């Protein structure tokens with residue numbers, strides 16, 4: 507019933523309107539008749555593939571456990587009464603106005619707006635990391651905003667407990683560790699992504715675009731300068747590490763040269779987030795306490811996860827995952 511595709515969510519949810527489609531599934535807005543408000547609904551069809559089943563169950567488990575102002579919640583979940591009839595899952599969430607991707611594509615943000623958006627991203631990230639979770643895919647299109655500039659992080663399908671390469675729409679926010687296929691990356695990958703997002707808010711253009719990870723790395727080296735051997739002490743492809751060390755030397759571009767109109771405090775924080783070496787990268791608590799954010803900083807108002815996360819699903823056959831998804835969504839069935 508939308509774009510020639512079945513969106514079977516009535517009778518509670520009616521007046522459907524298309525929002526978007528992508529790897530995450532298809533998202534519409536709908537009128538919730540029980541709550542008398544419009545909501546967002548994501549349709550997902552994961553049961554054929556083992557990795558989609560993983561991500562679906564992971565997203566559901568995480569978001570049902572999380573509760574934070576700057577993290578999207580799950581309001582309801584629609585699926586068939588029988589596991590045999592279940593082919594699709596519809597996840598109902600708060601309807602926001604837009605995402606940061608669309609906002610940045612056409613709108614200018616004042617420094618005060620950039621400051622408040624970044625605070626909310628980091629405040630949410632603090633909660634996620636406190637739950638021992640890596641998001642792993644932060645980017646402008648999964649930062650949702652409403653009219654009053656409130657921000658929520660969504661899209662936790664790629665998330666993981668903190669102890670690829672499928673298709674993705676964009677790789678521009680991925681830390682160097684990730685796209686050098688390093689094994690043993692940590693929370694600091696999310697800080698890199700946030701740094702990339704901050705840069706994009708400052709200029710309305712991606713800081714490290716590129717057609718493949720090699721082109722992206724050239725962009726990164728073109729700004730940060732050549733990496734030392736210590737920057738590359740991870741377990742990574744030796745030929746890839748050797749290629750990087752072999753490139754013509756690049757000097758660091760001063761941040762104020764790239765961003766001549768930015769707040770100097772913003773750029774000082776930006777610098778600490780976009781450090782090549784992940785060990786030297788600022789952590790989220792320190793970032794929140796940076797002078798750039800001091801007008802918003804409040805440790806008594808930056809909650810952490812009550813029950814930090816402990817699940818493994820990697821090893822499970824999809825039919826066992828399907829079962830677990832069926833069980834996890836049972837509480838939302840009438841009744």
Ligand SMILES: CCCn1cc(-c2c[nH]c3ncc(-c4ccncc4)nc23)cn1
Nearest residue numbers: 546599600601602603604605647648661
């Ligand atoms: C890659 C993330 C896909 N995703 C978006 C949502 C979502 C939940 N509530 C929303 N409210 C509004 C919008 C939205 C976005 C753009 N333009 C308009 C409206 N999106 C959502 C969930 N998953």
